[PDB]
Amino acid sequence: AGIAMKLAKDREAAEGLGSHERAIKYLNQDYETLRNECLEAGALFQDPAFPPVSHSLGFKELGPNSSKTYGIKWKRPTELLSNPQFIVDGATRTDICQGALGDSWLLAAIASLTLNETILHRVVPYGQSFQEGYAGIFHFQLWQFGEWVDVVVDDLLPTKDGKLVFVHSAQGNEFWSALLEKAYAKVNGSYEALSGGCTSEAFEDFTGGVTEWYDLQKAPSDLYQIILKALERGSLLGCSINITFKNLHAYSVTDAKQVTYQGQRVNLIRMRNPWGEVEWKGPWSNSYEWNKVDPYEREQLRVKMEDGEFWMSFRDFIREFTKLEICNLTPLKSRTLRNWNTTFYEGTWRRGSTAGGCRNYPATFWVNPQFKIRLEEVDDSRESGCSFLLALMQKDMETIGFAVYQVPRELVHLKRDFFLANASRAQSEHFINLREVSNRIRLPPGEYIVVPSTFEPNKEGDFLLRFFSEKKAGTQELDDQIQANLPSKLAGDDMEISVKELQTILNRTNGFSLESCRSMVNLMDRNGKLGLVEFNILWNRIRNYLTIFRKFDLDKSGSMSAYEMRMAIEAAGFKLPCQLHQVIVARFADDELIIDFDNFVRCLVRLEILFKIFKQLDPENTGTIQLDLISWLSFSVLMHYSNIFVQLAGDDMEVSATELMNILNKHPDLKGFGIDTCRSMVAVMDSDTTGKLGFEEFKYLWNNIKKWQGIYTDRSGPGAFEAAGFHLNQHIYSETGNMDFDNFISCLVRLDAMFRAFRSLDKNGTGQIQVNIQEWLQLTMYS
């Protein structure tokens, strides 16, 4: 909880988890184990997570009451098929068929899956039956925002009259698809969840590929050579007509062919209806044809297929409105045609740091992250190649789009200067209000920079940008290296000595505060007391800093836009990656995305103390550093959807330090609580880097305060610690014996936090964790 249950997915992830080879366990349920726990108990499985109740079916228009949805009676296939087939292929046609109270679109992804065998069990694994090893549980595998997930589900099915009122087989009763959708309907939420899907989306979710598209009649004068070049890579191309020729869902192009016919060109293209009927009144129209002058040679080359021949010519434009292609990731891995080189990058946009907006907001456009593309060899005339597809998905979503500029010669992190100064070469055609926006793009050989984002700023988001090219292309993140430069009336209570309370001396306006205080007190040296001789080395530290905040504070405001911290930080000496800039502002910045001299220096001071550690705990400079539990413990001390009940003004989550100091801090029994505190609790239990806390993560924190609350005073203002969870061995530390609720409760929150951090990281109970500057910066900063 925090960045640490977010540092682990990274380490895992970059180690397979998330791959088709290694899916993720949706809801932490497992098919084999479920299956056996059924097997060894006499029970058919019942899906706890996606219960066959009534909400699963939706929420309005199709969940509760809605006659639409009435009288549904959930049943299993084995409960209506003397001997069910889950799947039994080698099939040619497909008898598939929409929902009878289902929406057709999806039909078409599902059907276009059974033409390729290898693709289909990639989403539908072998091993399953309604006989051999039954039990009442099937699993599937789906692409979701770039990670592959193993989804299970139970064979129950939404029904009426004993007939399935969703997707299904028409004569031939098989049921694989009939459960694919269940599972699909499941990882979204409900079956309305999928009302107004989108075919393309489907497809990418049953393959982990990208879907490019064109307006056929509107087509690029290069459509035929894209059609080709995709086909020679096993891409999934299908074609659609949106409301003699075709008076009549799918049809896909499976092939493509240049024949000589009367001493000219002619380009044919070979289509196919997965549901088998040709119906196309002819073999090459009535017109231009098959058997007619057209030498078998340059005509055997045609005939090679079935259930959906058609061999239509490229005025396959006048018949057919669009054409979506799903180009595959290298793994049909088999020296089947050509490859498709690939690379993906997971990214985010946060308020007041990386969420810049587009170019047309030059004040920010430059804080969006960056990603460099390097195009070397050119395509196999538009002059010289070096082409690629660029696709940018967002994990009532936001308008997104992108644009791509060309590197000056730098073979880091382009500042604002760069973009008010150079021109955009390539960009997405429009910005849009929908999942993933992509375009094909052709550019000379060069090093280009690529900048994704939303249209307006301050819209927070996660995205996956992707690159697929016909020829090898280097790709990487474009960001900065963790950089840090330098690798009197003391009113003493006796001699040398000045404890903290320095918040006296270092004071219109507010100043310092015991936490800045204490951190500056800490840089000092490792009692708690400073003195008058090295409160010199310090003084200037401040005034220097002070000479900074002013540079961005013209308007003597106090304040300072988060957006610009990045450059301040760097004035001061530190150069950190966008991720680190994103932690800075989620912890110190305010709700207007401002930062004042206090929250200013602190973070500047902090960072100063953390390098200094990482610089000590590592002599032989090897990049990493060493923490067993016992150090860690210190060093880590210096107008829709009810879902799931809060009180939250119709805004789903959104608890901020602000909201978190408006509730807690609210009677006799001695309950103050403060922004600072509040702030820091929020970090630690946030693992999103948004500055806020979710329903679950507020739930987990709340049940402790509420349990910690009686925790043990003799109706006044004790290791109530072990008493609570934490049994401690050695120490304790910071009037007489105090600790008050404000401290006690907030103490119990960081000890709990950092203890969980520990485990997460040190998953094999090895007993010591270990991390580079980066994962170490993340953790101590953010808190």
Swiss-Prot record:
Region (Domain III) location: 331-480
Annotated EF-hand domain residues: 494-507, 512-535, 540-573
Required cofactor names: Ca(2+)
Molecular function in Gene Ontology: calcium ion binding; calcium-dependent cysteine-type endopeptidase activity; cytoskeletal protein binding; enzyme binding; peptidase activity
Source organism, top-level taxon: Eukaryota
UniProt GO BP: cellular response to hydrogen peroxide; mammary gland involution; negative regulation of actin filament polymerization; negative regulation of non-canonical NF-kappaB signal transduction; positive regulation of cardiac muscle cell apoptotic process; positive regulation of leukocyte tethering or rolling; positive regulation of vascular permeability; protein autoprocessing
Binding site for Ca(2+) 1: D525, N527, K529, E534
Catalytic reactions of this protein: Broad endopeptidase specificity
Cofactor: record remark: Binds 4 Ca(2+) ions.
E.C. code: 3.4.22.52
Domain Calpain catalytic intervals: 49-330
Keywords: Autocatalytic cleavage, Calcium, Cell membrane, Cytoplasm, Hydrolase, Membrane, Metal-binding, Phosphoprotein, Protease, Repeat, Thiol protease
Sites bearing Phosphothreonine, chain numbering: T330
Active site positions, chain numbering: S104, H249, N273
Binding site for Ca(2+) 2: D553, D555, S557, S559, E564
Regulation affecting activity: Activated by micromolar concentrations of calcium and inhibited by calpastatin.
Enzyme class: hydrolase
Subcellular location: Cytoplasm; Cell membrane
Family assignment from sequence similarity: Belongs to the peptidase C2 family.
UniProt function note: Calcium-regulated non-lysosomal thiol-protease which catalyzes limited proteolysis of substrates involved in cytoskeletal remodeling and signal transduction. Proteolytically cleaves CTBP1 at 'Asn-364', 'Gly-377' and 'His-399'. Cleaves and activates caspase-7 (CASP7).
Quaternary state and interactors: Forms a heterodimer with a small (regulatory) subunit CAPNS1.
Entry protein name: Calpain-1 catalytic subunit
Gene: Capn1
